């Protein structure tokens, strides 16, 4: 609640392992690159070096656990994602009218990205179509999921 | 660019996918499976950050084109575009 | 990053340089030499666009770091940072 | 005044020449790359292809004069640069107090960027130091140059 809980530190150590592939105790630009790309991002070599340099204490060119904590301490604060999620839905609002039909939602979700099964799409629509009119007012639906 | 558009459609579909799955697993279930929530939160941040990456590349592309336009306009003060 | 900072200082000094020269050549002279104004307008847009490029790269760098922080935070909803 | 003047078109043709190095009548990604870098920018190969594709009519992979006009037509509008110029000065406002001394201005302008001579610096300071106190209130000075 106040910048720290021995429980967080524990989890953050588990996090370090998500980065330190060889668990050699340090994160290199090569390991950081692999993780960033596993998240669908594509940092250049200089950008990887800059991420490390930003919190490179002993300037050895790599990040160790202690340094992996100043980077977090500096940005513990979170903020709601409502507007960004609404914008993601708007990508599929063909006519820019604020609605996406139940049919268009199935067409998007069963074909794009990682996808949902038709049965998962039925469950999502059951919750999103509040009026039962086969249309999803997405600004309202996102407000409800993020409320 | 078709590649950038493609990045947007896939990433946006995934933001819908993971927002739904996080909501379902943290509000429409009797027993919250944190392991599942973590998995979907990882996929959620990945899709949100991919859309941010496309938006920043589009702002970069736009300023590169505005640089060409500004240079062309010199052939015509401190105003730009 | 020292390289990015260096890009900023040089580009910023050039925005000061060319803004001054455009002003001088278009307001503090008896006869406006357009050829000179064009030259300085080209150097002005180049410096302004270099500063925009650094700012966009810094926003990119910042979101890459926020992606690492978001992924680390999954080990701990729809909130991000 | 209204999207066009036969005089502009004339100048824009001179502009095309700033881009068409070999004057072969077309601008390639290679020529665009050379010009963009001459402006201190560093577009990637994909970014160069995207600039061309944005206004690639006959989809031949290059930009010809006619296409070089839709790109301009779409953004003839200009806007004032006051705030951006003020931000450039703020880079040298060491204490973030709104002022840069006449001495610090000489130190910056005779060392960084393309540089001004000490004599040019004297002329700039004469105009910028309105109060004669050896200090430049840069927000005021920029407002005066952009007014
Ligand atoms: Ca390692
Ligand atoms: Ca270090
Ligand atoms: Ca050519
Ligand atoms: Ca073409």
Curated annotation (Swiss-Prot), chains A, D:
Subunit structure: Homotetramer. Interacts with CEP97, CCP110, TTN/titin and SRY. Interacts with MYO5A and RRAD. Interacts with USP6; the interaction is calcium dependent. Interacts with CDK5RAP2. Interacts with SCN5A. Interacts with RYR1. Interacts with FCHO1. Interacts with MIP in a 1:2 stoichiometry; the interaction with the cytoplasmic domains from two MIP subunits promotes MIP water channel closure. Interacts with ORAI1; this may play a role in the regulation of ORAI1-mediated calcium transport. Interacts with SYT7. Interacts with MYO10 and MYO1C.
Chain segments carrying region Necessary and sufficient for interaction with PCP4: 76-147
Family matches, as InterPro entries: CALM/Myosin/TropC-like (IPR050230), EF-hand-dom_pair (IPR011992), EF_Hand_1_Ca_BS (IPR018247), EF_hand_dom (IPR002048)
One biological process term in Gene Ontology: regulation of release of sequestered calcium ion into cytosol by sarcoplasmic reticulum
Protein name listed in UniProt: Calmodulin-1
Residue numbers of N-acetylalanine PTMs: 1
Species in which this protein is naturally found: Rattus norvegicus
Residues given in the record as Ca(2+) 2 binding sites: 56, 58, 60, 62, 67
Subcellular locations according to the entry: Cytoplasm, Cytoskeleton, Spindle; Cytoplasm, Cytoskeleton, Spindle pole; Cytoplasm, Cytoskeleton, Microtubule organizing center, Centrosome; Cell projection, Cilium, Flagellum
PTM per Swiss-Prot/TrEMBL: Ubiquitination results in a strongly decreased activity.
Location of Phosphoserine modifications: 81, 101
Note: This protein has four functional calcium-binding sites.
Residues of the EF-hand domain: 7-42, 43-78, 80-115, 116-147
From Swiss-Prot, chains B, C:
Tissue: Brain.
Source species, domain of life: Eukaryota
Subcellular localization, as worded in the UniProt entry: Membrane; Cytoplasm, Myofibril, Sarcomere, Z line
Chain segments carrying region Calmodulin-binding: 1-75
Protein family according to the UniProt entry: Belongs to the potassium channel KCNN family. KCa2.2/KCNN2 subfamily.
Function noted in UniProt: Small conductance calcium-activated potassium channel that mediates the voltage-independent transmembrane transfer of potassium across the cell membrane through a constitutive interaction with calmodulin which binds the intracellular calcium allowing its opening. The current is characterized by a voltage-independent activation, an intracellular calcium concentration increase-dependent activation and a single-channel conductance of about 3 picosiemens.
Comment text on domains: The calmodulin-binding domain (CaMBD) forms an elongated dimer with a calmodulin molecule bound at each end; each calmodulin wraps around three alpha-helices, two from one CaMBD subunit and one from the other. The coiled-coil domaim mediates heteromeic assembly.
Subunit structure: Homodimer. Heteromultimer with KCNN1 and KCNN3. The complex is composed of 4 channel subunits each of which binds to a calmodulin subunit which regulates the channel activity through calcium-binding. Interacts (via N-terminal domain) with MPP2.
Record protein name field: Small conductance calcium-activated potassium channel protein 2
Gene behind this protein: Kcnn2
Part of the whole protein covered: 413 to 487 of 580
């Amino acid at each position: 609640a106040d910048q720290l809980t021995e429980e967080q530190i524990a989890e953050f150590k588990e996090a370090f392992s998500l980065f330190d592939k060889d668990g050699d105790g340090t994160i290199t630009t090569k390991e950081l690159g692999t993780v960033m790309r596993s998240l669908g991002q594509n940092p250049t070599e200089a950008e990887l070096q800059d991420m490390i340099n930003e919190v490179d204490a002993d300037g050895n060119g790599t990040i160790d656990f202690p340094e992996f904590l100043t980077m977090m301490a500096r940005k513990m604060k979170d903020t709601d994602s409502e507007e960004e999620i609404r914008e993601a839905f708007r990508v599929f609002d063909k006519d820019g009218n604020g609605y996406i039909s139940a049919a268009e939602l199935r067409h998007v979700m069963t074909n794009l990205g990682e996808k949902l099964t038709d049965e998962e799409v039925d469950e999502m629509i059951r919750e999103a179509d509040i009026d039962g009119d086969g249309q999803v007012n997405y600004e309202e639906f996102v407000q409800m999921m993020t409320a | 660019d078709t590649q950038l558009t493609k990045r947007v459609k896939n990433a946006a579909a995934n933001v819908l996918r993971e927002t739904w799955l996080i909501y379902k697993n943290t509000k429409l279930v009797k027993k919250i499976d944190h392991a599942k929530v973590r998995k979907h939160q990882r996929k959620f941040l990945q899709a949100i950050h991919q859309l941010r990456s496309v938006k920043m590349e589009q702002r970069k592309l736009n300023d590169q084109a505005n640089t060409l336009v500004d240079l062309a306009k010199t052939q015509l003060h401190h105003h730009h575009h």
